[PDB]
Design a protein around this nucleic acid. Structure first.
Ligand SMILES: [Zn+2]
Ligand SMILES: [Zn+2]
Ligand SMILES: [Zn+2]
Lengths: 130, 401
RNA sequence: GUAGUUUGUACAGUUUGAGGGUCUAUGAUACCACCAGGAGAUAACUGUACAGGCCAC
């Protein structure tokens, strides 16, 4: 593995275009005071899927030298874990709950609550607050 | 409270029907799906049944018929177009009496070829052909009479080999393994099949019955020709593949004319037999056709029954065709009854002890067994109802050039 | 009226292909955001019946 590792915290991160910045507490295993700015980009990210960071979560990384702030070769979470993304296998049609499905949520059935006005009349995709 | 009841009524919208007090064996189930005809355990079972895969077939399968059922009745121009279509079907390639002359001579040719070396035997034209209750590309029903000092399966050895050395025909199947052992042939002039059966007297009696009805009533020929052609295009007429027999289709359309009030054929048993009882209908066993307007009957006393009314059809053929499709797509509940044209009121399955989850149809001179047992698979049954649905969809649909 | 024999077909749990606007995409401060109303799609194991159906009573 590389010598070029690092660690720190996320400065900001755009999910959609997939880059942000990091503020580093460590460089190549050596602690830093004050922290330094280092890039993060989705081509550098180790995770699968839509590679993205929470805008403030803790991170680890590898680096190389760059003008507009340090440039990362690789970025991970702490200990190499997968990054979160901006924090905000389907909703159970008996209750709207993500954690269960039809036979997983065998409670007695419910009528159609419109979620925009919190009343059982219609559907939230037809409620004009959209 | 009541919101949960309305949401299980939303389950009932997808065809789950609840019970409260049940049979002791049916204590297991709070619900039932009438589409699947299968009892359902509880509200969780209803939640299961809304996901259940046969029910999904059943839901779409049931919802399909509502479209064609809503498709519009024919305008006078639409009536004329339907009539023109069915008569050009009946005439241009359908077997009229004129084409029946050719098919009868084909049967005569079969008789000539076989009885060249079986001269004591004689081959008799019968079935859908002779009735004029026919179809465009058809198989002629031929019946061998033979002296009973010989066995008809043994005789079929002396029937097959000439056709297996024949110079006139193709499609010589060695169809010994049919329920009546036959040898098949294709006449190459008409381009159509031929089937050589033997000793089927009751089928010949029903053939004379339908021929008498066609002699009385003209629409008889055109309408059934059309229906048969359609079933064929729809492959329902192949009784070996889970379908319905063509003979049974003929009796089906005869039942349609027998029940399309004002009925354009008269029923065989009723008040003109004084002291008749439909609840012992079997005792009034029919016999041979008389004058091609009457059918005989006998018991251990005997007499005849009219096959005619005082006036023939004076209604447009296209209207008859559209309501004939409407009858056996939406009116006759296929599974609930036997097609029983012996009696004006429909004879039920349990009235002849037959099972229910398919069509039942009876032979007119033999009410002994159902001749519509071939439908058993509900998938094939749904396919057949879907073909009937496509019929009443297209032929109720107007057109553009 | 009740069995021993397996099928498609519902099947009950498990194992499951997508986790479902999935997809997506700007190398140095802009993402997230902002349109769902629909009981969640196949192959394998296992638990029962429908009814086709084997061997009987
Ligand atoms: Zn739920
Ligand atoms: Zn609303
Ligand atoms: Zn169902």
């Amino acid at each position: 593995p590389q010598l070029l590792h690092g660690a720190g915290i996320c400065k900001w991160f755009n999910v959609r275009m997939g880059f942000g910045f990091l503020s580093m507490t460590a460089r190549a295993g050596v602690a830093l005071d004050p922290p330094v700015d280092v890039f993060v980009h989705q081509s550098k990210l180790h995770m699968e899927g839509f590679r993205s960071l929470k805008e403030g979560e803790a991170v680890e990384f590898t680096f190389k030298k760059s003008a507009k702030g340090l440039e990362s070769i690789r970025v991970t979470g702490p200990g190499g874990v997968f990054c979160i993304g901006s924090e905000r296998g389907d909703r159970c049609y008996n209750c709207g709950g993500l954690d269960h499905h039809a036979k997983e949520c065998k409670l007695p059935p419910q009528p159609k609550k419109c979620h925009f006005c919190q009343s059982i009349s219609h559907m939230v995709a037809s409620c004009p607050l959209k | 409270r009541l919101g949960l009841k309305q949401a299980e009524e939303r389950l009932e919208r997808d065809h789950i029907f609840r019970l409260e007090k049940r049979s002791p064996e049916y204590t297991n189930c709070r619900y039932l799906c009438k589409l699947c005809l299968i009892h359902i355990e509880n509200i969780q079972g209803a939640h299961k049944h809304i996901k259940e895969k046969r029910h999904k077939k059943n839901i779409l399968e049931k919802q399909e018929e509502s479209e064609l059922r809503s498709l519009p009745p024919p305008s006078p121009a639409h009536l004329a177009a339907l009539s023109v279509a069915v008569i050009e079907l009946a005439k241009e390639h359908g077997i009229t009496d004129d084409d029946l002359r050719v098919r009868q001579e084909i049967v005569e040719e079969m008789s000539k070829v076989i009885t060249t070396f079986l001269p004591e035997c004689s081959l008799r034209l019968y079935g859908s052909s002779l009735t004029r209750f026919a179809l465009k590309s058809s198989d002629v029903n031929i019946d061998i009479k033979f002296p009973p000092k010989m066995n008809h399966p043994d005789l079929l050895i002396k029937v097959l080999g000439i056709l297996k050395k024949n110079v006139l025909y193709v499609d010589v199947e060695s169809d010994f393994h049919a329920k009546v052992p036959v040898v098949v042939c294709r006449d190459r002039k008409s381009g159509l099949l031929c089937r050589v059966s033997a000793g089927n007297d009751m089928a010949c009696l029903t053939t004379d019955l339908l021929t008498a009805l066609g002699k009385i009533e003209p629409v008889f020929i055109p309408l059934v020709l059309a229906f048969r052609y359609w079933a064929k295009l729809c492959y329902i007429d192949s009784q070996t593949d889970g379908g319905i027999p063509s003979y049974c289709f003929a009796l089906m359309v005869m039942f349609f004319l027998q029940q399309r009030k004002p009925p354009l054929l008269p029923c065989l048993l009723g008040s003109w037999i004084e002291g008749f009882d439909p609840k012992r209908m079997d005792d009034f066993q029919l016999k041979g056709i008389v004058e091609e307007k009457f059918v005989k009957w006998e018991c251990n006393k005997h007499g005849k029954s009219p096959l005619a009314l005082e006036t023939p059809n004076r209604v447009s053929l296209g209207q008859l065709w559209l309501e004939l499709l409407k009858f056996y797509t939406l009116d006759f509940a296929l599974e609930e009854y036997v097609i029983c044209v012996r009696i004006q009121d429909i004879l039920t399955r349990e009235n002849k002890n037959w099972p229910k989850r398919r069509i039942a149809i009876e032979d007119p001179f033999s009410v002994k067994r159902n001749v519509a047992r071939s439908l058993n698979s509900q998938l094939v049954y749904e396919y057949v109802v879907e073909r009937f649905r496509a019929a009443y969809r297209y032929f109720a649909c107007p057109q553009t050039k």
